Amino acid sequence: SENRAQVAARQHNRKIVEQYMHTRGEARLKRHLLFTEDGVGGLWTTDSGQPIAIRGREKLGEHAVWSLQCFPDWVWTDIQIFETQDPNWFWVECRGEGAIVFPGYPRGQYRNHFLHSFRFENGLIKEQREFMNPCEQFRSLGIEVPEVRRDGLPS
Amino acid sequence: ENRAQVAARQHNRKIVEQYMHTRGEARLKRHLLFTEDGVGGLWTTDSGQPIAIRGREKLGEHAVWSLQCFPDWVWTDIQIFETQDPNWFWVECRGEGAIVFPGYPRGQYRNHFLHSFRFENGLIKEQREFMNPCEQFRSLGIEVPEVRRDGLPS
Ligand SMILES: O=C(c1ccccc1O)c1c(-c2ccc(O)cc2)sc2cc(O)ccc12
Numbered sequence: 118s119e120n121r122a123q124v125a126a127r128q129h130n131r132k133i134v135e136q137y138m139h140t141r142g143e144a145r146l147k148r149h150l151l152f153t154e155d156g157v158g159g160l161w162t163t164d165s166g167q168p169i170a171i172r173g174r175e176k177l178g179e180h181a182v183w184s185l186q187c188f189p190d191w192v193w194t195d196i197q198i199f200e201t202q203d204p205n206w207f208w209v210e211c212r213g214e215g216a217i218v219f220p221g222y223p224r225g226q227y228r229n230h231f232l233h234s235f236r237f238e239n240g241l242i243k244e245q246r247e248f249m250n251p252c253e254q255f256r257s258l259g260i261e262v263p264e265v266r267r268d269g270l271p272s
Numbered sequence: 273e274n275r276a277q278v279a280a281r282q283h284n285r286k287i288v289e290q291y292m293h294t295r296g297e298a299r300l301k302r303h304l305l306f307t308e309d310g311v312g313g314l315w316t317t318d319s320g321q322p323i324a325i326r327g328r329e330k331l332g333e334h335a336v337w338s339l340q341c342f343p344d345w346v347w348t349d350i351q352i353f354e355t356q357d358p359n360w361f362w363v364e365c366r367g368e369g370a371i372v373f374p375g376y377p378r379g380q381y382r383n384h385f386l387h388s389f390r391f392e393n394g395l396i397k398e399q400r401e402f403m404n405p406c407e408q409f410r411s412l413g414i415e416v417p418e419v420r421r422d423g424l425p426s
């Protein structure tokens with residue numbers, strides 16, 4: 118029963134995506150338990166143009182400790198979960214917001230729009246990726262954002 | 273209800289595929305894939321606000337500009353995602369081409385993109401594209417700031 122197996126996987130995986138997106142506060146310290154042992158998470162949109170990937174359930178648990186310090190009240194909001202034709206692949210559109218307490222920068226407030234990709238293997242997350250506009254993180258840190266000159270562009 | 277949803281999803285998928293494969297002079301007619309009041313544009317920009325192109329007529333005018341400033345643009349590595357909403361699709365892809373912006377040196381622009389497509393009565397009501405603007409800055413020779421990482425776990 119291929120269809121029955123796919124339906125069951127999609128239903129379970131959706132529950133894991135929901136749980137991930139609703140994980141807040143001290144529960145963030147256990148969010149890595151939603152991943153496979155070799156699971157990868159992280160931020161795919163950065164100033165360098167390369168992802169910052171956090172590799173392995175153990176490193177993901179270590180990152181959570183840092184995350185609670187530097188984003189102490191972070192929440193995802195406006196959460197819209199998208200199932201796909203692949204029962205093991207979901208997308209989420211949402212916003213996120215919270216204080217940002219990055220080392221060596223003034224404390225700030227960070228808001229952004231996010232897309233998340235979740236790929237599953239055997240009931241847990243194998244790959245999580247988040248995509249945002251880094252310009253908004255720059256603004257939250259007081260970093261000057263470059264501006265494309267629009268004089269010559271239609272408007 | 274289910275027959276209607278299946279029919280919508282199958283037709284809408286063909287439109288997404290056509291959009292993503294549209295290149296060259298055919299870009300001048302891509303706006304015909306939209307409703308009269310359809311919206312398209314770039315949701316990730318330096319200002320933090322979208323640059324939305326409102327209405328099928330304005331979309332057709334934007335295509336003319338697009339063919340001048342992105343004269344050979346191609347979408348590659350296209351992955352189309354249907355969803356539980358037969359009228360909502362997402363696409364993960366890359367894009368590449370020359371960038372010829374007014375008052376900047378000619379460059380080569382490459383980026384990773386996500387696209388959202390929402391449909392109404394067989395045509396695109398809302399198209400949005402999401403990318404990392406730092407790569408467009410680099411293509412234009414604009415300096416990209418660097419978040420200092422010394423204090424961050426490595
Ligand atoms: O915000 C993050 C981040 C990274 C990965 C996962 C979640 C995040 O929020 C970040 C960096 C970072 C690197 C190492 C580390 O241990 C903690 C954070 S560097 C950097 C540069 C940018 O332009 C924009 C964001 C960032």
Ligand SMILES: O=C(c1ccccc1O)c1c(-c2ccc(O)cc2)sc2cc(O)ccc12
Binds near residue numbers: 272324337405
């Ligand atoms: O590239 C675009 C663009 C905008 C909308 C749809 C497709 C696009 O590719 C663009 C701008 C633009 C504005 C008016 C116009 O008529 C033509 C282009 S300004 C700007 C500033 C940024 O930081 C990054 C990108 C851009």
